[PDB]
Every structure is written in C-alpha cells, then in structure tokens.
C-alpha cells in the first residue's frame, strides 16, 4: 500500500472528465486529475524523476517500489511552448515526495490553457495489483490522491 501524494494543490476530478481522449480513455495510464489551485508541481512519491518535458509542463517518476507515474499540467498545454512553467529538478534526480519538480504561473495558465485539469496517472498499469482513487480537496505534497499496491 503506497500512498501517492498530490503533486499539486487543487480539487480532484475523474481522469475520464479531462477534455482529451488519450488521457480520458486512460491510454497514458489510469488515475485521477486535479483542478489546480496552487503554483508548483512536486514529486508525488519518493523515487527517481524519469523525464521532464522540454516545455516544462509534465514529468514522469518511478517510485522506489517500481510504480511509474506521469503528472501532466493541463490539457494541450504543450502548445504554450513552456510559457508559464519553470523547471526546478532534473531527469534522473533522486527525490522525496514533496520535492519541487516544476513551478508555474497559475494566473497566466488559467488564461492561456485550453484546460488546467491535471492528470496524475500510473503509466505501468500492467505491473500493479490494484488502484484506489481518492477524492476531495488536496494540498500539494500533503494530501494523498491515490493508493497503489505494486
């Protein structure tokens, strides 16, 4: 039973409610999405940062347990070209849940992004035993959002 800590503050929404088929259809993976209320994305677990997109709006992380996560700020946000995001951590970086990965300008984003809904999913669904989704309000680095059993 591993707890997945909110990578950013906001209100939880079903992953299938995001305005994008690859996410909504759970193609990238399964989990939930968050309506952002804060200003930063942090590691949702203790482990290793995998990738960090060059537009700084998304990253992947592998927990030391073997669970692979993918956090993606908003939808279609890649077309903002990195505008509004600031990279803090780096690929391969060892981190503790709560560690800052990226910082973002929310005001700017709620204005320019097609949608601010942020998926946080397990990308290697085949390698996990079960996924439980939590709900409600969550605060970055504190409130867990999912519970996975590798």
């Amino acid at each position: 039973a591993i707890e997945i800590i909110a990578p950013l503050s906001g209100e939880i929404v079903n992953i299938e409610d995001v305005p994008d088929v690859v996410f909504a259809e759970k193609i990238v993976g399964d989990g939930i999405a968050i309506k952002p209320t804060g200003n930063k994305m942090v590691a949702p677990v203790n482990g290793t940062i995998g990738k960090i997109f060059e537009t700084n709006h998304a990253f992947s992380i592998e927990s030391d347990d073997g669970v692979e996560l993918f956090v993606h700020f908003g939808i279609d946000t890649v077309e903002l070209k990195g505008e509004g995001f600031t990279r803090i951590a780096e690929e391969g970086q060892t981190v503790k849940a709560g560690d800052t990965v990226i910082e973002f300008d929310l005001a700017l984003l709620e204005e320019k992004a097609k949608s601010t809904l942020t998926p946080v999913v397990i990308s290697n669904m085949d390698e996990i035993k079960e996924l439980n989704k939590l709900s409600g309000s969550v605060v970055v680095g504190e409130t867990p959002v999912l519970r996975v059993t590798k």
Partner: protein
C-alpha cells in the same frame, strides 16, 4: 524548404490558405493522430515528449502559428525529433532478447515513418526517414518469431513492393491484401497483423497504393487499383498463400480502392472490409475540400503530381475520385461481400457511404462504430471485422 512549404501554391490560393489557418487556429501544420499512432505502437508518453521537444524549440519556423514547422534538420524539426526517438528505440534494440529486439525495431520503424508523415514526394528529410523505416522494418522481421517476406512484383516496367506476413510456412494460408491511406506507409500496420490477423493464422500482405510509399514511382491515375490487381495475379505463384482464399482490408482512401478491386475481380476475392473509407460524400463537396487543413491539400497536390496548385481547380478534379461518379455504384452489385465501417462523425466517411457500399454488395453490411470510448469502441469492432473475414475466407 520545409515540409509545410513545399507545395507551390498560386498567390491567389496562398491567401485562402492563410484565411483557413487563422480560422481553425490549430497550433500545428500536420494533423496529429495521437490515438492512431498509439494503436500502431507508439508509446503515449514518448509521443508527448517528442511533441514537447518540437513545440519548445526556439529555432525559426516557417509559420510560428505551427510549432510543427521548424526549418532545418536540427532540434525542433519534426523529422529530426521523431528520427531521434526512432534511433533511441533502434539503438537500445541492440541489447535485448530477440522477441524484445524486434519489437524495439518495429517501434523504431514506426517513429521513422511518423518522422516522414505526411510523406510529400519532394520532402528529402521524409524520404531518408522512409529508408530508415524500411530498414528497421526489415531488421525487426529477422528477429521476429513470425515470417515477414518482402516481395517484388514486376509491373509497368518497374516493380511493386509488398510485404507478406506469415505466422508460419506450414500449410498455405488465407491472405488478406491490406492497404491504408494516402498519408501512410504500408509498413504502418504491423499491429494489425501481430494482434489481430496472426492470432487467426491469417496471412497479411500489405501494399502501397500508386503514388504512396514504395509505390510512389507509380502515378495516381484513373485506375488506381491496378497495383492491387497486379498483386492479385502474383498470388497464384506464392507457395505460402491460398490464392483461392483472398480477403481485402482497406483504410481511408485505401478502402475506396478495395471496393473498386472488389468490383473488378469479384471471382478472385472472397471478402472485403473497409474502414474510414471516403466513398462519395466528401468527394461531392468542393466547399469542404477547399476548406480542409493545408496538410491534406499538400498531400493531394503531391499524389496528383501537381506542379502548382489552385485550391479551387483541385477541388474540382476530386469529383472524379467518387465511386458513384465512376460507376461502380449505381446499377449492378458485386458478388463480393463488403463490410464497411467508420467512426460516428467521421467527416471523411459518413454512415451514408458505408451505406452505398453495403447496398451494391451481396451480403454486405454497413455498421457504424460510435464515439463512446473511441479506443474501446474500435478494438471491439475491429475484432468483429476479423471474425467476419475469418468466416468468409473459410
């Protein structure tokens, strides 16, 4: 030049293009087919990662509204970033078992293909990307448990290239001749074989329509199903297939040609299945055609060998590509049973088109696949379509 600026346009037409762009918005030149590419094998996260390398580049683009159009073969460029992902898969194939090595090569092959998409004849970057695609596909077959033969069939003082996928060379196998659309390569359907045809021991023989991929040296003329006919004739001399049990599957325009072939060779074809095929509607609609995204017009101009485009003039010609406007559909019906399908809403293929086709076909049924979970609502249909062909071929 750069992909988006290869198709020479007339000043009068270049303006309508400008109008259409600032009208759709769209932050991309090319039509992104995220879902389609995932089904063909691309990792969904690597795909977003590539698009991020492309969108985040600050190198000069042909049109800044299309982060898709960086000029030059260096970081940021479409071909360049997809090729990078292709090499990565290919390089790491160098240290995997054999089943795993092949899958990494096939995936490498697909990236190379996307790298060249939409494959305009004048695109030199897309062309060598195509060479990488072919090569990677060859190497993947070597290390596969399956049999993939690259066949060469003499034709019009030249040769047709087709790929024969066999589960094994034990007993002869029913074969399905497969062809996709004008912006695809025949090698983009490995998954259709590995996860759907192979499972039933059905052989898959892919072919590129004239002017597309390996068949790009052949002009796209009135009879654009001639290549497929030529392949049909060669079947009787291929020991691995049951030339008496031949099926057809066609995607997009590929489907138009398959219906066609299904009228021209009724006696030598057991069943035909088409998906997202543009039968008549879109062809009977010049408003729509001259409205479509520039990528699609660039594609047509390329397949048709145009030297300079007049978007209005082209909209005209297209009326000919209609099967109703050609004759196949009107009075006589084909003995070949044809299953026509497409997604709810497909602008290019309305249920009304799978309608005509179903009509002029003995035992032919038109069944729509609706949007409710596009992904789920496809694998299902696609699996039905196969059981259907498994039946008609047996």
């Amino acid at each position: 030049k750069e992909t988006s600026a290869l198709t020479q346009y007339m000043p009068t037409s270049q303006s309508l293009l400008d109008e259409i762009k600032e009208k759709n918005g769209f932050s991309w030149y090319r039509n992104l087919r995220r879902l389609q590419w995932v089904w063909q094998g691309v990792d969904p996260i690597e795909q977003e990662q590539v698009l991020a390398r492309i969108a985040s580049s600050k190198h000069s683009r042909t049109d800044e509204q299309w982060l898709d159009t960086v000029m030059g073969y260096h970081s940021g460029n479409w071909a360049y970033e997809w090729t990078r992902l292709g090499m990565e898969h290919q390089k790491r194939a160098g240290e995997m078992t054999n089943e795993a090595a092949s899958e990494a090569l096939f995936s490498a092959s697909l990236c190379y293909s996307i790298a060249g998409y939409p494959h305009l004849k004048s695109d030199n970057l897309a062309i060598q990307a195509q060479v990488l695609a072919n090569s990677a596909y060859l190497e993947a077959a070597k290390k596969s448990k399956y049999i993939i033969k690259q066949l060469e069939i003499p034709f019009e003082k030249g040769k047709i290239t087709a790929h024969l996928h066999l589960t094994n060379t034990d007993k002869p196998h029913p074969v399905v001749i497969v062809s996709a659309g004008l912006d695809s390569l025949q090698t983009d359907m490995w998954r259709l074989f590995r996860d759907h045809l192979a499972k039933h021991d059905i052989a898959m023989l892919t072919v590129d329509m004239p002017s597309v991929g390996y068949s790009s040296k052949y002009p796209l003329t009135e009879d654009y199903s001639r290549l497929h006919q030529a392949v049909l004739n060669e079947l009787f001399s291929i020991p691995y297939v049951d030339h008496h049990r031949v099926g057809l599957i066609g995607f997009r325009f590929g489907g138009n040609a398959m219906v066609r072939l299904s009228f021209l060779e009724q006696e030598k074809i057991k069943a035909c299945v088409i998906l997202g095929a543009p039968i008549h509607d879109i062809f009977a609609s010049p408003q729509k055609l001259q409205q479509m995204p520039k990528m699609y017009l660039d594609v047509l101009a390329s397949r048709l060998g145009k030297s300079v485009v007049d978007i209005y003039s082209l909209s005209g010609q297209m009326a000919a590509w209609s099967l109703k406007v050609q004759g196949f559909l009107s009075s006589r019906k084909t003995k070949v049973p044809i299953l026509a399908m497409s997604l709810e809403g497909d602008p290019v293929s309305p249920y009304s088109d799978n309608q005509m086709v179903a009509f002029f076909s003995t035992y032919g049924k038109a069944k729509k696949i609706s949007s409710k979970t596009i992904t789920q609502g496809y694998e299902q249909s696609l699996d039905l379509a196969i059981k259907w062909l498994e039946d008609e071929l047996l």
